[PDB]
Structures are given as structure tokens and as C-alpha cells.
Amino acid sequence: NTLQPGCNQACYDRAFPISHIRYWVFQIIMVCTPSLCFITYSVHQSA
């Protein structure tokens, strides 16, 4: 509720510094990373 140009962008950025979806995607990939490490180690071990 304002007429100031650029206030919407600043207020949105302050309210939601990181979108929930981005954080959840990052979390999912990170938690899956150890499994990928294990699979790569298993593949490298065989031949």
C-alpha cells in the first residue's frame, strides 16, 4: 500500500529473502548427495 516506486521490490525481498521452494530444492539435493557419493564409490570400486 504505497505509491513509492521500488518499494514493492524492497519489501518483497525483505519479507522473503529466499523462496521456500528454492530452499526445499536445495535441501532435497543436499540430503540426496550422500547417497550419490555412495553410489559413485560403489561404481568406482567395481572395475
Place this chain on the structure above:
Amino acid sequence: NTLQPGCNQACYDRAFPISHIRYWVFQIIMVCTPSLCFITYSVHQSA
């Protein structure tokens, strides 16, 4: 600086409850009133 309807009216009313021009006109007429009273009394006294 707002998008709220009716904020301009309320804020102008609060900032300037009475316009300067209206106050000055009222002051001028009131200060001239005693002279009008004297002139009317003089006219009535004569016949």
C-alpha cells in the same frame, strides 16, 4: 504517498482544518463590523 482511497481527503483536512483565506476573510469582516455598527447608528440617529 499512498494508495489508500480517502487518505488524501483526511490528511488535507487534518493539515489545514481551515484555509488561511477563509480565516482572513472572516477576520476582515469582523474587524470592519464595529465600523458598520457605528455608521448604522449614525444613520439611524439622523431622522
